[PDB]
Every structure is written in structure tokens, then in C-alpha cells.
Ligand binder design. Structure first.
Ligand code: HEM
Ligand code: HEM
Ligand code: HEM
Ligand code: HEM
Lengths: 282, 146, 146
């Protein structure tokens, strides 16, 4: 969410950008193409030399959309709906790339707005661009009634084993992605550890609660959202690693139930849980 | 790349049991269903609108055979993945224009499929070894991008 | 990593204009403000309640000097980053428990701070060179994690 203060900061900053928005848009893409050359894979049809009309035109269109977004900051999904459809259904840019363009737009503004780019305004602009990116990728895949049905079917089949599977998921995570161990320095992480079994059951129980409240997850998970944002402070990238390891765990235990369509529904459900758990971080 | 004796033994033993034909099509199919924006590279494969349509698509199965075959020949050269995949790296960048992020996604789905197919035999330490390998292959395939 | 000679000179040329103690405190301060979950390591530093408390915090400013001076020294060893930072890597994993994702965040906040400080002088190619260096430093600090 964008605080009221955030919105005020973005408007001030973007107002300063003024009639330069297009130029700055073209600059941000040029910086991205140079710093992160994999992003050029989405523009093979473009002359990407410096100052090309295609790049300038892209920068201007992107700039117009951000202005639109800023002017309708309390109604972004609706304001950008045509743009979210287009990226989800036609362009199909991998979501990671939105982070990269956001970083280069931040660099561009920093380089052109010495007076205005204070720490707080930096913070607000970053949050704003993350919000835009979220909106632009929102329709790539809300859980449909089929997803909801699939998630209840598979989780119902986990049943009393929920806790054991949560523990296995953490063990898989710790072995596969050793950096996640940095959040548990106070634990015995050996195989069989009762501390890891206890962690697994608590997470499993929370997931059971989320399945039961699949249409009211922000409230059902609100105390846990608080705890991770303000106390535990787990970097958001780690939630994706645990989600992959829960999927692997379910796959190895539910051969008949883990169909392609159920796998897709589970991946969407864990991403939504992950979104809710990191929603109060900033 | 570097793997302990235990890690390489785990990878090697499991792989002896993999039907490359079937696992390759399953993994690519699930990629297309779970991350549908990846369908952008396969517009000529025809109908991929539903999971069932994707999984039974003949061009999906055939291409499945193709990529996992090259993956398997990679497992015979785990000490020089970059040299092994150099030409295909170039091909995916300059000719196919594939965002390297997709290599990581396909890597993770393959791991999911190995778990699904092998169940309890796909233990946490065997998964760990396979996650190293898939990351090393993704890194090798992205190496020549410019 | 491995930079061209022209990228090295560009990195070196701009760095001669940096006030290491000031920029170090500013980049650490903005990290803590923009990504407040990183505050989890610095609870002993005192008041971090608002951006001004943070930017004005003397313990933040002192730690700023510390980390960016080690960074600065690493610019002299761009051909041996992994070797230059091996001990620091071990320390951050085994004793400090710092998720390496934080090094990438700080790297990107440093780039923002440089752009803010040097304006038009921080050109797209100079940024590209710095993006490589901060990724290289992040990778080298993450190298000994186990
Ligand atoms: C803040 C994020 C973004 C915004 C606001 C945005 C907006 C837009 C807009 C308004 C268009 C043109 C629509 C039209 O002409 O019908 C467009 C096109 C496009 N966008 Fe996005 N975009 C964003 C991020 C990205 C990213 C990260 C990439 C890829 C690295 C990307 C790649 C493309 C492509 C390939 C096109 C088509 C260009 C053409 O063929 O003319 N977009 N974008
Ligand atoms: C979507 C996945 C997750 C859910 C639903 C979840 C849920 C929970 C729950 C229910 C608790 C216990 C709170 C209590 O004591 O009442 C907890 C604690 C904790 N979580 Fe999360 N968690 C998730 C992801 C993660 C991830 C990915 C990490 C870090 C890699 C993490 C790190 C922790 C830590 C460090 C604790 C406290 C352990 C202790 O010292 O007792 N969590 N979480
Ligand atoms: C483990 C990673 C991968 C390996 C080892 C691999 C390998 C290969 C090989 C050997 C070919 C055959 C080229 C030819 O004979 O013309 C190929 C083609 C292709 N690959 Fe990759 N690939 C991988 C991942 C991906 C991913 C993730 C995507 C896209 C999401 C992709 C998309 C394509 C496309 C579009 C073709 C051409 C298909 C056709 O011409 O019908 N590849 N790949
Ligand atoms: C390229 C990035 C970084 C470099 C070069 C660096 C460097 C250093 C140095 C030189 C020390 C002192 C070691 C000693 O006491 O012998 C240190 C300590 C420390 N660093 Fe890092 N660091 C970096 C990033 C980070 C990040 C992003 C965090 C956390 C968000 C962090 C957290 C800490 C903590 C908690 C200490 C201990 C300070 C104290 O005990 O007073 N470091 N760092």
C-alpha cells in the first residue's frame, strides 16, 4: 500500500519531472539496456542505438503511463487496466524485469532531481514503482473458483500430515538454499531436529488457516503479516524459495493429486500467501 | 562446476532411471501451464490453451526430448558446463531471444517433476544436488548473452 | 565480472571524487529507510524511528565509514574480489547471519547515491560499469556462505 504521505511525495517529484518525463523515460531504458543486457531480449525488433526514435518513443509512452498512474494513484488497477492486459496477454515480459526498469528509473530521477531526491522521497518512489509493477503483472495468471477447489482438494489430502510436510519443506529449503539458514542461527538444523519440526508444524497450521479463509486471507493472516514485517524481517525473496520447496514436498507425497492444473493452482496460492505476508513490510 | 562426491553420486544414480523422452515433455508442459507467459516462445506449437491441450501437444513432447537430451549430455561434463553450453548459449541469445530468467524457471519445474515421478527417493539431499546442477546449467546457458 | 580497461578507468576516475565517509553513511542510511527490514541487524544503533533519526544517527554514520572503506579498498583488487573478501564473507555468514540479498540491495542503493551525487556525470555507461562492480562485490561477499 502507498501511504498518504507516499502519494504526496510522488506527486511532488513527478511534478518536478514535468515536461521532461519522456526524455527521462528514454534515458531509463538506455540505462537498463546497458546495465542489464538480458532485457534487450524483449526488443529484438528495435534499433537500440543511443537516441534512436524507437527508444525515445518507447520512453515517451512509458512516461505517459506513469503520469496517468500518478494522477490516479488511488485507482491504479483501473487506470492501467489496458496496460496490464497487454503485458499479460501479448508482451509477456517476465516479471523480474520490472524490478530492473524500476531501478534504472530511480537512478535517472536521482541524476536529474538533486534537490528533490531525499531519503523519504526515494522511499516513496521505490514503493510507487513496485506498486505499478504489481499492477502491470497482476493478470499474468485473485484465485479463481477452480484454483480454490484445487487447493482445497490437495490440502484436504495432506490432512493430518500437514506438519510433517512443513518440516520436510524447511529441511529441503535449508539444504537447497543455504542462505535461508541465516534466519535460524539459534536452531539445531540437523535432520530430525525437533526445532525444525516445530517450525514446520506452525507454518503448516498457518497454511491450513489460509486455505480455510482463502477469500479473507489478509485478515486471517494479519497477525503473521505484522510479525514478519516488524519483528522477523525476512527478506521477501526467501518466501519464493520456501514456496518452491513446499511444492517439491507435495509433489513427492501426492503422486496422483499433483497434476499440472493442480500444480499451477498451488503455485498461485503460495504466491498469494507470500504477497499477504510481505504486505506490511514498507 | 564443483560438487561433493556425494552430490555427484546422487545426481548420477537418479539420472540413470530417467526416461528423457517422457520427463522432458512433462517438464516443458508444466512450464507452459504454470508460467503461461513462457508461451511467447512457442507460438508455432499450436494449441496450448488448456493444461490438457498443452500436455498432449505433440510438438511440446518432441521439443521436450530435444532440450532434455542436451541437458543430459551436460551431466556428462559437469566440470565444464560453460564450455559445453557455449554454442547453445549464443543460439538462445542471438537467434531465439530467450530471457535467461526462463532457464531458472524450467530448472525449478524439472525439479518438481523429478520429485513427482520418484517420490520418497527424491530426498532433501538429492534435491539439493539437483538444485545446484540446474542453477549451474542456467548460468552456463546465460553466459554468452550480450 | 572481469571489466574492460575502459570500464576500470571509469570506475576509478569517479571514485577519486567520492567522500567515502559521507557517501558510506548516506548509502547505509537510505538502505535502512527504503528497505526497513534491513534494520533487523542494527537494533543496537539506537533511534531509527524516522528518516532523519536514521540519517542523523552517529552509529549509522560510523558503520557507513566502515563498510564503504572496505569496499573502496576492494576497488584496488578488482581482479581478485573473491580472494580479497573471503574472510569478510565467512564473518557475515557464520557470525553476523546476513542474508546475502542485503548486499545486492545495498549495492543498488549505492548506485542511486552516486547518481544523486554526480548527476549528469553518472552516465549510462558509467552506471553499467558500477553495476558490474557492485554485483561482483555482492557475489564475492556471498561466496563462502554454507
Ligand atoms: C513501469 C513499467 C512499465 C510501463 C509503465 C510500461 C508501459 C508500456 C506502454 C505504455 C507500452 C506501449 C503500449 C502500446 O503502444 O500499445 C509498452 C510497450 C512495451 N513494453 Fe512495457 N512498460 C513497463 C515495463 C516494461 C518492461 C520491464 C519491459 C521489458 C524489459 C517492457 C517491454 C515492452 C515491450 C516489448 C513493449 C512493446 C514495444 C513496441 O513493440 O512498440 N515493458 N510498455
Ligand atoms: C508462506 C510461508 C510462511 C508462513 C505461513 C510462515 C509462518 C510462520 C508462523 C506461523 C510462525 C510462528 C509465529 C508464532 O510463534 O506464533 C513463523 C515464525 C518464523 N518465521 Fe515464518 N512463515 C513463512 C515463511 C517464512 C520464511 C520463508 C522464513 C525465513 C526463511 C521464515 C522465518 C521465520 C522465523 C525465523 C520465525 C521464528 C522462529 C523462532 O525463533 O521461533 N518464515 N512463521
Ligand atoms: C535446460 C535449459 C535448456 C536447454 C538445455 C535447451 C536446449 C535447446 C536445444 C538443444 C534446442 C534445439 C535447437 C535446434 O536444434 O534448432 C533448443 C531450442 C529452443 N529452445 Fe531451448 N533449451 C533450454 C531452455 C529453454 C527455455 C527455458 C526456453 C524458453 C522458455 C527455450 C526455448 C527454445 C526455443 C523457442 C527453441 C526452438 C524450438 C523450435 O525451433 O521448434 N529453451 N533448446
Ligand atoms: C559490500 C557490502 C558490505 C561490505 C564491504 C561490508 C563490510 C563490513 C566490514 C568491513 C565489517 C567489519 C568486520 C569486523 O568487525 O572485523 C562489517 C560488519 C558488519 N556488517 Fe557488513 N558489509 C557490507 C554489507 C552489509 C550489509 C548489507 C549488512 C546488513 C544489512 C551488513 C551488516 C553488518 C553488521 C551487522 C556488522 C557488524 C558491525 C558491528 O558489530 O559494529 N553488512 N561489514
Amino acid at each position: 500500500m502507498l501511504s498518504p504521505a507516499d502519494k504526496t511525495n510522488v506527486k511532488a517529484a513527478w511534478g518536478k519531472v514535468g515536461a521532461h518525463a519522456g526524455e527521462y523515460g528514454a534515458e531509463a531504458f538506455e540505462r537498463m539496456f546497458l546495465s542489464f543486457p538480458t532485457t534487450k531480449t524483449y526488443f529484438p525488433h528495435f534499433d537500440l542505438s543511443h537516441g534512436s526514435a524507437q527508444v525515445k518513443g518507447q520512453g515517451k509512452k512509458v512516461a505517459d503511463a506513469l503520469t496517468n498512474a500518478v494522477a490516479h494513484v488511488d485507482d491504479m488497477p483501473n487506470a492501467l487496466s489496458a496496460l496490464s492486459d497487454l503485458h499479460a496477454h501479448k508482451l509477456r515480459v517476465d516479471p523480474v524485469n520490472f524490478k530492473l526498469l524500476s531501478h534504472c528509473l530511480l537512478v535517472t530521477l536521482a541524476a536529474h532531481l538533486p534537490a528533490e531526491f531525499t531519503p523519504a522521497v526515494h522511499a516513496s518512489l521505490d514503493k510507487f514503482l513496485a506498486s505499478v509493477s504489481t499492477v502491470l503483472t497482476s493478470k499474468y495468471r485473485v484465485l479463481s473458483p477452480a484454483d480454490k477447489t484445487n487447493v482445497k482438494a490437495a490440502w484436504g489430502k495432506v490432512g493430518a500430515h500437514a506438519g510433517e510436510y512443513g518440516a520436510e519443506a524447511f529441511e529441503r529449503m535449508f539444504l537447497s538454499f543455504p542462505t535461508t539458514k541465516t534466519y535460524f542461527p539459534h536452531f539445531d538444523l540437523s535432520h530430525g531436529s525437533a526445532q525444525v519440526k516445530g517450525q514446520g508444524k506452525k507454518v503448516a497450521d498457518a497454511l491450513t488457516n489460509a486455505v480455510a479463509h482463502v477469500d479473507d486471507m489478509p485478515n486471517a493472516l494479519s497477525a503473521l503479516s505484522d510479525l514478519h514485517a516488524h519483528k522477523l524481517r525476512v527478506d521477501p525473496v526467501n518466501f519464493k524459495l520456501l514456496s518452491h520447496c513446499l511444492l517439491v514436498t507435495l509433489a513427492a507425497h501426492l503422486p496422483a493429486e499433483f497434476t499440472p492444473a493442480v500444480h499451477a493452482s498451488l503455485d498461485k496460492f503460495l504466491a498469494s500467501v507470500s504477497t499477504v505476508l510481505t504486505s506490511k513490510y514498507r | 562446476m564443483h560438487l561433493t562426491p556425494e552430490e555427484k553420486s546422487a545426481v548420477t544414480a537418479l539420472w540413470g532411471k530417467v526416461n528423457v523422452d517422457e520427463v522432458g515433455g512433462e517438464a516443458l508442459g508444466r512450464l507452459l501451464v504454470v508460467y503461461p507467459w513462457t508461451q511467447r516462445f512457442f507460438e508455432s506449437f499450436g494449441d496450448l490453451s488448456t493444461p490438457d491441450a498443452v500436455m498432449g501437444n505433440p510438438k511440446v513432447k518432441a521439443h521436450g526430448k530435444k532440450w532434455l537430451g542436451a541437458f543430459s549430455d551436460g551431466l556428462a561434463h559437469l566440470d565444464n558446463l560453460k564450455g559445453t553450453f557455449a554454442t547453445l548459449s549464443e543460439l538462445h541469445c542471438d537467434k531465439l531471444h530467450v530471457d535467461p530468467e526462463n532457464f531458472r524457471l524450467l530448472g525449478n519445474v524439472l525439479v518438481c517433476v523429478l520429485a513427482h515421478h520418484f517420490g520418497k527417493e527424491f530426498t532433501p539431499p538429492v534435491q539439493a544436488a539437483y538444485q545446484k546442477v540446474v542453477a549451474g546449467v542456467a548460468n552456463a546457458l546465460a553466459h554468452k548473452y550480450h
